Amino acid sequence: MGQWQIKIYSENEREFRELIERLEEERPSVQYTETTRNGRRQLTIRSNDKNEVDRILEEVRRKVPNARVRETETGSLEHHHHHH
């Protein structure tokens, strides 16, 4: 249970431009946002579907050898769940 968010950190131009184009061309269409913060650009990708996020996840690892990626699954990410 939770939305999947892929944060890509890649400094080179080819790396980001690959994913940017792919996300628009992948049927139907993938949500994303690029923002150059702290001197480096970050591609924050927001997916609705699992098979979709898996396509994006491999796409950055296969197309981009300069990929610092952390998939943050926004849903169940609370600190120490209160069982009591």
Side-chain angles (χ1 to χ4, degrees), residues 14-30 32 55-56 59-60 63:
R14 172 59 57 134
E15 314 311 92
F16 266 39
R17 288 187 177 179
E18 254 301 289
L19 276 295
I20 297 294
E21 300 178 287
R22 300 305 171 179
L23 300 171
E24 300 189 272
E25 304 307 271
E26 299 322 296
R27 270 58 187 170
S29 189
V30 182
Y32 67 97
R55 177 183 300 194
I56 307 161
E59 263 296 275
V60 61
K63 297 296 188 57

Side-chain angles (χ1 to χ4, degrees), residues 13-61:
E13 193 60 66
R14 172 59 57 134
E15 314 311 92
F16 266 39
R17 288 187 177 179
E18 254 301 289
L19 276 295
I20 297 294
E21 300 178 287
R22 300 305 171 179
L23 300 171
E24 300 189 272
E25 304 307 271
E26 299 322 296
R27 270 58 187 170
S29 189
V30 182
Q31 299 187 92
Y32 67 97
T33 179
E34 185 279 291
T35 298
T36 307
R37 183 174 55 184
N38 306 148
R40 284 179 167 154
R41 45 178 159 197
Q42 56 178 90
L43 224 180
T44 306
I45 302 179
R46 313 188 308 170
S47 57
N48 66 93
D49 184 76
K50 188 60 176 61
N51 309 271
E52 177 179 66
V53 67
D54 292 314
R55 177 183 300 194
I56 307 161
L57 205 163
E58 63 181 304
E59 263 296 275
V60 61
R61 296 182 63 201

Side-chain angles (χ1 to χ4, degrees), residues 77-84:
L77 74 172
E78 63 184 278
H79 302 253
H80 77 92
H81 176 86
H82 293 248
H83 186 87
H84 292 274

